[PDB]
């Protein structure tokens, strides 16, 4: 019953077509209703429609006249219905169609030529039916068809005389997934005019039948091939033989429970560019296993190797120089595996490798020596992902071989050590270092001295020792733009900690114990660590137990755009504390103990605010405490989410629970 010029009447239990819909609509959506029929008359009014979606209904058959009533119809969706019988008239007059969806209609067989007048059809979908044959006509039609979906059917064999009807057709996708096919007739694929992508996913094949398939794909125009979950136990140099006569670029062999990959298995793929091998059971990756895959650019090995048997000590072995053939490999996804460790010549050869994901790729890579990543000496690696690898120690000069490294993720580990600074030696192109979620980091003065070009530093929940050093550990980080020090429960911080970080824009300091530093009773006075941060943009100071705020803490934060002081015990704020925040756009003070909001404090702050968040607060509902605040609320343009529901007063008890 809604209209965006696209009428959406979904889930309305309509037993008959609405007759009050505007004549401006071009798309009609009638999914999930109780329509028994679709009379042409009821659509005579809607002669300007271009898209009709009547999926999920109880429509038995269609009237031919209906197709005449919609001359501008491009997309016809008849999915999930009782449309079991098709005729030559049913889709005859819908010659302007481009998309036809016919999934889940319990169609046991398509008779003659119901699709002979669909010469403008691009995508034909017949998924989830009882089709035992790929034959859809007795002549050559559907010349402009690109995508044919016969997935999830009872199709057991592909024959030539059933497929040649697309001889003048150019198919980019032949979806035959979830089909128990057991035979490929000779010349059944050559019968197609143009075949670019074949999809035999979830299709019980085997090495031999796969070999036969590749044989029948020889000398074809195939570009994409999907054999996911085809139960391909093992591969040999004969398996993908026919593919020698193809210009195949993408191959998907995922979920095949692939146990053994024989030598020169993919030597017949010199044109292959994208290889998907994720989720498998490879026990031993031999040397010549990836022989002749020099044009491969993307390689996915996520969970491709067998898990640890613990008792049988069955760890997946990778021979040295197993990647030396992928000269043009650029993206390597080896995450989530049980590999023992990185051999001296593991990644030797990948002279174009730019991305390496080793997240949980190893059983236990507990120590990173200077000889660990020696196999990445001649690789132009830019992004290295070493999360979830149970790393406990990073020795000196460990990342020396990765001179071009930009992004290093060392988070999610057991890393507990002192940052000597020698860890980062060689990193002259480093941009961001992730260390979040670890054991402990004992900082020194020369911890980050060797990487002054670092711009993002993530130390979220890692326990910072000696962070209260007089020459800041962060001191050499001049170009540091983002600094995360949250969830570390830091109890002491010197004023000179952020000194030298003039380019710092984003600062995360939530969930620590910094309240003691902002009380006036603090021995030596309050700690003004935010002095000099001219280019500071986003500041997070939530969950610090703050109950006092010195008047001149945010005095030098001119470019400060966002400030988050939520989840604290704040109550009384000094006057003119936000007086210098001229670029302030977002103010957060939710879940506090604030009772009063006066002009002398929140005056200059509320000036150009676009987002204010003071949700859960025990407001004191008297004149001298809420007058100016309410007066500002009633006239402000500042977006204040959940203003009516979650803004309640506590005292006096008369206004207890009152907005």
């Amino acid at each position: 019953t809604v209209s965006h010029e696209v009428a959406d009447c979904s889930h309305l239990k309509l037993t008959q077509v609405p007759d009050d819909l505007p004549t401006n609509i071009t798309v009609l959506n009638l999914t999930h209703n109780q329509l028994r029929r679709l009379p042409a008359a009821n659509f005579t009014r809607y002669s300007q429609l271009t898209s009709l979606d009547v999926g999920f209904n109880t429509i038995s058959k269609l009237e031919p006249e209906l197709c005449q009533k919609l001359p501008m119809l491009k997309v016809l969706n008849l999915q999930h219905n009782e449309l079991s019988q098709l005729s030559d008239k049913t889709f005859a007059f819908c010659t302007n169609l481009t998309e036809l969806h016919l999934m889940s209609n319990s169609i046991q067989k398509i008779k003659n030529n119901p699709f002979v007048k669909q010469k403008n059809l691009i995508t034909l979908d017949l998924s989830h039916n009882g089709l035992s044959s790929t034959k859809l006509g007795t002549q050559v039609q559907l010349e402009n068809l690109q995508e044919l979906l016969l997935s999830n059917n009872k199709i057991q064999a592909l024959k030539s005389e059933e497929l040649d009807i697309f001889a003048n057709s150019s198919l980019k996708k032949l979806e035959l997934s979830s089909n128990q096919i057991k035979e490929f007739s000779p010349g059944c694929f050559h019968a197609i005019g143009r075949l670019f992508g074949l999809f035999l996913n979830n299709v019980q094949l085997g090495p031999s039948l796969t070999e036969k398939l590749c044989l029948e794909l020889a000398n074809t125009s195939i570009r994409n091939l999907s054999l996911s979950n085809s139960q391909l136990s093992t591969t040999s140099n004969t398996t993908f033989l026919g593919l020698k006569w193809t210009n195949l670029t993408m191959l998907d062999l995922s979920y095949n429970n692939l146990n053994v990959v024989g030598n020169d298995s993919f030597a017949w793929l010199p044109q292959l560019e994208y290889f998907f091998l994720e989720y498998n059971n490879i026990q031993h990756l031999f040397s010549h296993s990836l022989h002749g895959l020099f044009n491969v650019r993307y390689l996915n090995l996520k969970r491709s190797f067998t898990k640890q048997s613990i008792s049988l000590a069955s760890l997946p072995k990778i021979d040295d120089f197993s990647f030396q053939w992928l000269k043009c490999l650029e993206h390597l996804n080896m995450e989530d595996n049980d590999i023992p460790g990185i051999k001296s010549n593991m990644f030797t050869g990948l002279i174009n490798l730019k991305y390496l994901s080793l997240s949980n790729s190893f059983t236990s890579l507990r120590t990173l020596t200077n000889e660990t990543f020696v196999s990445l000496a001649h690789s132009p690696l830019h992004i290295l992902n070493l999360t979830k690898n149970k790393i406990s120690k990073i020795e000196s000069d460990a990342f020396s071989w990765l001179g071009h490294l930009e992004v290093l993720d060392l988070g999610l580990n057991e890393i507990g050590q002192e940052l000597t600074g020698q860890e980062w030696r060689g990193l002259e192109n480093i941009f961001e270092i992730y260390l979040s979620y670890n054991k402990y980091l004992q900082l020194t003065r020369n911890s980050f001295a060797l990487v002054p070009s670092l711009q993002r530093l993530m130390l979220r929940r890692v326990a910072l020792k000696n962070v209260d050093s007089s020459p800041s550990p962060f001191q050499p980080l001049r170009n540091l733009t983002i600094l995360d020090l949250s969830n570390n429960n830091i109890a002491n911080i010197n004023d000179d900690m952020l000194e030298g970080l003039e380019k710092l824009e984003i600062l995360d300091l939530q969930h620590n114990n910094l309240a003691r530093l902002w009380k006036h009773a603090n021995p030596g006075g309050p700690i003004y660590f935010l002095k000099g941060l001219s280019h500071l943009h986003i500041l997070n100071l939530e969950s610090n137990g703050f109950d006092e705020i010195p008047v001149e803490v945010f005095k030098d934060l001119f470019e400060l755009k966002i400030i988050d002081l939520g989840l604290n015990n704040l109550n009384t704020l000094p006057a003119s504390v936000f007086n210098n925040q001229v670029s302030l756009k977002s103010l957060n003070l939710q879940k506090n103990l604030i009772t009063s909001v006066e002009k002398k404090v929140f005056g200059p702050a509320f000036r150009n605010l676009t987002e204010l968040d003071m949700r859960f607060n025990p407001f004191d509902c008297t004149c001298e405490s809420i007058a100016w605040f309410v007066n500002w609320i009633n006239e402000t343009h500042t977006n204040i989410p959940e203003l009516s529901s979650h803004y309640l007063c506590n005292t006096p008890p008369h206004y207890h629970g009152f907005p």
Partner: antibody, heavy 119, light 108 residues
Framework: QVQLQQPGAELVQPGTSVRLSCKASGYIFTTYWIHWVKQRPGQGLEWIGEINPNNGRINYNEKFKTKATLTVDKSSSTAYMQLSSLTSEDSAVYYC????????????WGQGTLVTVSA | DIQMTQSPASLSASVGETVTITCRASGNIHNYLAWYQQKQGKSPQLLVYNAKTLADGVPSRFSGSESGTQYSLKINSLQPEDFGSYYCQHFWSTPFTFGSGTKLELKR
């Protein structure tokens, strides 16, 4: 172009105190800390201490903890060092240094001031 | 307090020869080293930092090697203008200790 300038030499009386100046030019004085170094003629050098131009934080050498007193004039952009309880063993050359983009370096040195305790 | 034992104290070398000055650390200071050349009556100039890295402008003949706690300044093919005093220094832990120094003289 960054320069730290110190006076030529200073003669002093044994037992008194002397103030040494170190003017910074070519950069923003408060950026990098200022370090001090003592060197006897023909002998080796000794790192006196480092001082923060901003808040005035001072890290001392345990030998020079009672001999040297570091101060900093932020307005005049000058680092001062007071030497008290002067003996003949303090008669040496005093340099003031700074760090660079690599904080493990002393790229910038003043021409030094020759302190003579002899009256 | 980590000390710096520098050897030797005196060297005599002809033009074109290769010389090496050694520094020994009393404790681990990692690669944090600094070699300075000083001519009599001037300010010490930074030759090498981090034991192996050359300062900007410093001739290619100057080099540095690290091995254990031993750090060596190496001058290949001495030029007649490369003579004076040479000192070393660590930057790892406060306080900073310097070497005793090595006096280099021209022969031929």
């Amino acid at each position: 172009q960054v320069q730290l300038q110190q006076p030529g030499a200073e003669l002093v009386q044994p037992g008194t105190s002397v103030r040494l100046s170190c003017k910074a030019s070519g950069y923003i004085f408060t950026t990098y800390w200022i370090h001090w170094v003592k060197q006897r003629p023909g002998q080796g050098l000794e790192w006196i201490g480092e001082i923060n131009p901003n808040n005035g934080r001072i890290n001392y050498n345990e030998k020079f903890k009672t001999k040297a007193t570091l101060t900093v004039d932020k307005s005049s952009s000058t680092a001062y060092m007071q030497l008290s309880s002067l003996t003949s063993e303090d008669s040496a050359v005093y340099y003031c240094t700074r760090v660079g983009v690599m904080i493990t370096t002393f790229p910038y040195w003043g021409q030094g001031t020759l302190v003579t305790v002899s009256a | 307090d980590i000390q710096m034992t520098q050897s030797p104290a005196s060297l005599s070398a002809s033009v074109g020869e290769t010389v090496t000055i050694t520094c020994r650390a009393s404790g681990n200071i990692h690669n944090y080293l600094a070699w300075y050349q000083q001519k009599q009556g001037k300010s010490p100039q930074l030759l090498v930092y981090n034991a192996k890295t050359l300062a900007d402008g410093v001739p290619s003949r100057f080099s540095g090697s690290e091995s254990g706690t031993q750090y060596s300044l190496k001058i290949n093919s001495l030029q007649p203008e490369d003579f004076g005093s040479y000192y070393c220094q660590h930057f790892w832990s406060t306080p900073f200790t310097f070497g005793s120094g090595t006096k280099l003289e021209l022969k031929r």
